[PDB]
Amino acid sequence: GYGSWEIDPKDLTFLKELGTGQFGVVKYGKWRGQYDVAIKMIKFIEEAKVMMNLSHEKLVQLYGVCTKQRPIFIITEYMANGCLLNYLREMRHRFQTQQLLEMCKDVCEAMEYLESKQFLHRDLAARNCLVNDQGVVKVSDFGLSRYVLDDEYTSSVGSKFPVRWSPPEVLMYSKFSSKSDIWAFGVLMWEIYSLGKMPYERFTNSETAEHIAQGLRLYRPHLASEKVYTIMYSCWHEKADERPTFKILLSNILDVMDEE
Numbered sequence: 001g002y003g004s005w006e007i008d009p010k011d012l013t014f015l016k017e018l019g020t021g022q023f024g025v026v027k028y029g030k031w032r033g034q035y036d037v038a039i040k041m042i043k044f045i046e047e048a049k050v051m052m053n054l055s056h057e058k059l060v061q062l063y064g065v066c067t068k069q070r071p072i073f074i075i076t077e078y079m080a081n082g083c084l085l086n087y088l089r090e091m092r093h094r095f096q097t098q099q100l101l102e103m104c105k106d107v108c109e110a111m112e113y114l115e116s117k118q119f120l121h122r123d124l125a126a127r128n129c130l131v132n133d134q135g136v137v138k139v140s141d142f143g144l145s146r147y148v149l150d151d152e153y154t155s156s157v158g159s160k161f162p163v164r165w166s167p168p169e170v171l172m173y174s175k176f177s178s179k180s181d182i183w184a185f186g187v188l189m190w191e192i193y194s195l196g197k198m199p200y201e202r203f204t205n206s207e208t209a210e211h212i213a214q215g216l217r218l219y220r221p222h223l224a225s226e227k228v229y230t231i232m233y234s235c236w237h238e239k240a241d242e243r244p245t246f247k248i249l250l251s252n253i254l255d256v257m258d259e260e
């Protein structure tokens with residue numbers, strides 16, 4: 001069994017529907033009458049192990065599972081503001097650049113933790129992060145949580161590939177490494193500073209792969225200072241070994257926060 005991880009479904013309440021998709025319905029509810037939760041109802045062992053062994057303040061946390069019945073429930077921490085991509089696109093937030101840098105640091109801390117555990121995420125992107133009521137960004141879409149947010153890469157059986165978040169060696173040779181997560185992180189910083197624009201927005205995926213191969217890089221968003229742009233651009237070195245680590249990126253981000 002899952003021991004302390006197995007939740008009694010009698011302890012869950014269902015308050016509001018958050019979304020309906022390929023892997024089932026997600027509801028907001030309460031657990032044990034006091035904890036706000038997201039409850040996924042699956043329309044497993046391997047993906048469960050991933051979430052039961054990774055824990056960080058900037059990763060969306062698994063609280064437990066209901067597997068003694070069908071359909072299965074996956075219970076996680078509640079992130080009231082939904083995905084980071086839609087949060088960035090909501091122009092009423094009128095974000096200050098200080099807020100945008102804090103979102104970058106939240107994700108960088110999660111990634112530094114993942115890299116310290118030798119875990120490769122493989123689909124880092126603003127659509128795969130969630131935002132809580134306090135505006136804190138947390139990385140999701142790993143293990144069981146891929147099914148929670150009805151991930152299009154997972155639901156399409158790998159057909160919808162994240163071309164726009166991939167380095168040249170992934171596109172050409174399927175060479176995944178810590179350095180392909182570093183590249184995706186720089187694209188995520190670009191999504192944040194662009195207020196959620198699609199990277200390479202006027203190109204198709206095929207054109208993007210061709211231009212990347214030719215050395216095209218995303219332009220500096222107007223909200224990004226030259227120092228912030230240097231950080232995201234460092235993620236896109238043609239040579240994977242010349243890209244920084246997440247520990248280095250975190251130190252760069254803190255230095256900018258201290259300077260600005």
Ligand SMILES: */C(C)=C\C(=O)N[C@H]1CCCN(c2c(F)cc(C(N)=O)c3[nH]c(C)c(C)c23)C1
Binds near residue numbers: 020026076150
């Ligand atoms: C962004 C580009 C997409 C997006 O928000 N997709 C939804 C799809 C339905 C389920 N969603 C979801 C979720 F999986 C988990 C949580 C949570 N841990 O609180 C969640 N909160 C909200 C407000 C939503 C919509 C959530 C993601």
